[PDB]
Amino acid sequence: GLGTARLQLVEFSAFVEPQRHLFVHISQLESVDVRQIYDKFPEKKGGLRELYDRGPPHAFFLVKFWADLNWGFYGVSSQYESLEHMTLTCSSKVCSFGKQVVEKVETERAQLEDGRFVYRLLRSPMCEYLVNFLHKLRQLPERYMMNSVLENFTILQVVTNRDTQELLLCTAYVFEVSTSERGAQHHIYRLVR
Ligand SMILES: O=C(O)c1ccccc1Nc1cccc(Br)c1
């Protein structure tokens, strides 16, 4: 599972609408040494090197996606849950060639539902840099070319309790493109050092 005692990821999806086409989808555990991907993020130190230290270690995950890119409004929807009432700050960073080219910060208040609190960040428009990048990627003639380009791209999502500034979740995402027969797939991993 992608989560901790305090906050669990319940659903994540990135999609385009004219039904939906889902690039990646998670609906709800091997490990990986941080040092394996250190170079994929910067050392602003707003890439992982400085942030993992501050801790706690159990809040850090790596997700690998095999995206389905064979298919307007481009969106992202995420939903988390917890037993405690918080306000969440969600920082999302896109890193390209070791540099941070996007940072998106959003804030979501708890909603009471069925004896738990849910945090619904629904249909957040995908930022324009990504829509444009996807359009280009979509142009490439071969999948191995898409994957060459994507090896230089990573996303980091940091979720923090806004009122205390405690880190609840830190997730790194890396991407490849699957073949259409093989739909999208993900694998979630713990990060350790
Ligand atoms: O949706 C956005 O605008 C965004 C901005 C910064 C980092 C990630 C973002 N969305 C996104 C898009 C596809 C997969 C994943 Br994980 C996240």
The secondary structure of 138-159 as a DSSP string is HH-S-HHHHHHHHTTEEEEEEE
Q: Which CATH class is domain 1-193?
A: mainly beta
> Taking Cα atoms as reference points, which of 25, 126, 98 lies closest to residue 66?
25
Distances in Å between the Cα of 161 and the Cα atoms of 84, 87, 110 are 11, 6, 11
Backbone angles phi, psi at 131, to 5 degrees: -60, -45
Q: How far is the CA of 76 from the centre of ligand 1 (A)?
A: 7
| 112's tokens | 């009471």
Beta strand 185-192 with 73-82 is: unpaired
What is the C-alpha to C-alpha distance for residues 33 and 69, in angstroms, rounded to an integer? 29
CA–centroid distance for 151 within its chain: 16
User: Is the alpha carbon torsion for 92, 65, 63, 112 positive or negative?
Assistant: positive
Alpha helix positions (H), the chain: 48-54, 128-139, 143-150
Helices and strands (DSSP H and E) totals, the chain: 3, 12
Q: How far is the CA of 163 from the centre of ligand 1 (A)?
A: 24
149 CB-contact burial (10 Å; exposed 0-12 / middle 13-18 / buried 19+): middle
156 within 8 A of 48, measured Cβ to Cβ: yes
CB-based contact 96:153 (threshold 8 Å)? yes
Indicate which atom in ligand 1 lies nearest the CA of residue 23. Answer: 13
The residue with tokens 């004219």 is 18
**Residue 80: Cβ within 10 Å count:** 25
Residue type, 130: L
Do residues 115 and 121 make contact, with C-beta atoms less than 8 angstroms apart?
no
Whether residue 69 contacts residue 177, with contact meaning beta carbons closer than 8 Å, is answered with yes
CB of 155 closer than 6 angstroms to any ligand 1 atom = yes
Q: What is the DSSP letter of 97?
A: T
Using CA atoms, how far apart are residues 127 and 123, in angstroms rounded to an integer? 12
What is the distance in A from the centroid of ligand 1 to the CA of 35? Answer: 24
* The token pair that represents 124 in the structure block: 């957040």
Domain ranges of the chain: 1-193
Closest by CA to 133, choosing from 97, 185, 106, 158, is 97
State the Cα–Cα distance between residues 86 and 63, nearest whole angstrom.
25
Q: Which of 27, 139, 129 is nearest to 78 (CA)?
A: 27
CA distance 133 to 172: 19
Pocket test for ligand 1, best of 126, 129, 133, 171 (most atoms within 8 A of CB): 126
How far apart CA 50 and CA 52 sit, in angstroms, is: 6
Closest C-alpha to 80, from 113, 103, 47:
113
Q: Give the method used.
A: X-ray
**Tally of CB atoms within 10 A around 75:** 15
Separation of CA 13 and ligand 1 centre (Å): 10
CA distance 88 to 107: 6
For the chain, the first-to-last Cα distance in angstroms comes to: 20
